[PDB]
Structure 1
Amino acid sequence: MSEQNNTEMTFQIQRIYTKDISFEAPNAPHVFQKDWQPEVKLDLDTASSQLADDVYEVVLRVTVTASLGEETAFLCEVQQGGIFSIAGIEGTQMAHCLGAYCPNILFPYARECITSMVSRGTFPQLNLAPVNFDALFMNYLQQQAGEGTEEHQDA
């Protein structure tokens, strides 16, 4: 609870990689009867794991569903995982780091991965709008700090 460390948070990018993909078109040939703007649905899920000491692994899931009437258009889901060496983070600074800053790094890759699979189901272009996860999460916490003095040297 407000562990005042000498190092006010730490962030290092270690890896970004696709961990999971799903794209289902259950009525793929028959959806031709339901042709135009489908009801698209977003749902983001947060998964994490600690691989080693100060080495963490944040998975940002972006699920996209589409359907017209009572039948499906296309189903898609990506899990863009990313290894990050993070330490010093606490409370608000923790939640803002891995819950806003790190997802927003993984998001462009997850976005293009969905865009690829939709094209494999041979449907028109799906470009998701830029949501500022950083500022949106600051608004979730009303307002918070995102400014500090650097302290970095060989140790």
Structure 2
Amino acid sequence: MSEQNNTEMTFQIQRIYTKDISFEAPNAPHVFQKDWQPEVKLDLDTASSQLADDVYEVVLRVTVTASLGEETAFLCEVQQGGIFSIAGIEGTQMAHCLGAYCPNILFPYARECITSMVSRGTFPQLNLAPVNFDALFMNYLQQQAGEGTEEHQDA
């Protein structure tokens, strides 16, 4: 079993970088007739890899679907990868590292990259909200609502 103690751990960011950029505007020439903020639909995937020993390379995938009315406006997908040299963590701690924390570092860069390609496609402004992967990860390990059943009784 996981017979490791002492909350020390260590990693250093070796490299942050975009691995993939995508922007498909299929209706673009015609859809510009509709001057409006196209309805945003978010997608998020997270991958990792082993380059060398203690050297793990996490890939954050963000995909943004958008449409003016009932027809597509734009489709902008970015994959912000990152090399991190991790040690000390294991079990729940390593699942928190590569499954939440490592994507959460890459997230601002993935955001600016999406907005760049939307700007290049001459579509309205796109700013994605900060998703705290680490907080929602803690809730994932239980898959249930928070327990704080009390009786203040203010009347």
Give, in angstroms, the shift of residue 3 of structure 1. 4.0
**TM-score, with length taken from structure 2:** 0.84
Q: Which blocks of at least 5 consecutive residues in structure 1 are unaligned?
A: none
Identity percentage over the alignment? 100
Q: Which runs of 4+ in 1 moved over 6 A?
A: 143-155
C-alpha distance 73-151 of structure 1, shift in aligned 2 (>3 A): same
- Residue 144 of structure 2 corresponds to 144
Instruction: Using the TM superposition, name which of 144-153 and 2-11 deviates more.
Output: 144-153
Judge conservation of contact 1:8–1:148 (CA < 8 Å) in 2: no
| DSSP 3-state at the match of 1:81 | strand
Stretch deviating more after TM superposition (138-147 or 65-74): 138-147
* CA contact 2:14–2:84 (8 Å) conserved in 1: yes
Q: Secondary structure at the match of 1:30?
A: helix
Between 1:110-119 and 1:4-13, the stretch displaced more is 4-13
Alignment CA distance shift 1:152-1:88 (3 Å): farther
Task: Give the alignment's TM-score, normalised by structure 1.
Answer: 0.84
| Cα shift at 1:71 | 1.5
Q: Does the CA contact (< 8 Å) of 1:3 and 1:90 recur in 2? A: no
- For 1:147 and 1:13, the matched residues in 2 are separated by 36
Pair 117,152 (structure 1): closer, same or farther in 2 beyond 3 Å: farther
How many Å separate the matches in 2 of 1:19 and 1:72? 25
Q: Which moved more, 1:84-93 or 1:136-145?
A: 136-145
CA contact (8 A) 2:9 2:89 kept: yes
**How many pairs were matched up?**
155
Over the aligned positions, Cα root-mean-square deviation in angstroms equals 9.8
* Counterpart-to-counterpart distance in 1, 2:153 and 2:4: 20
* Residue 102 of structure 1: how far off its partner (Å): 0.8
1:145–1:109 distance in 2 versus 1, CA, 3 Å: farther
1:24–1:74 CA contact under 8 A, matched in 2: yes
Q: CA deviation at 1:146?
A: 18
Distance change >3 Å, CA 153–CA 35, structure 1 → 2: closer
- Give 1 or 2 for the bigger CA radius of gyration: 2
Residue number in structure 2 paired with 1:10: 10
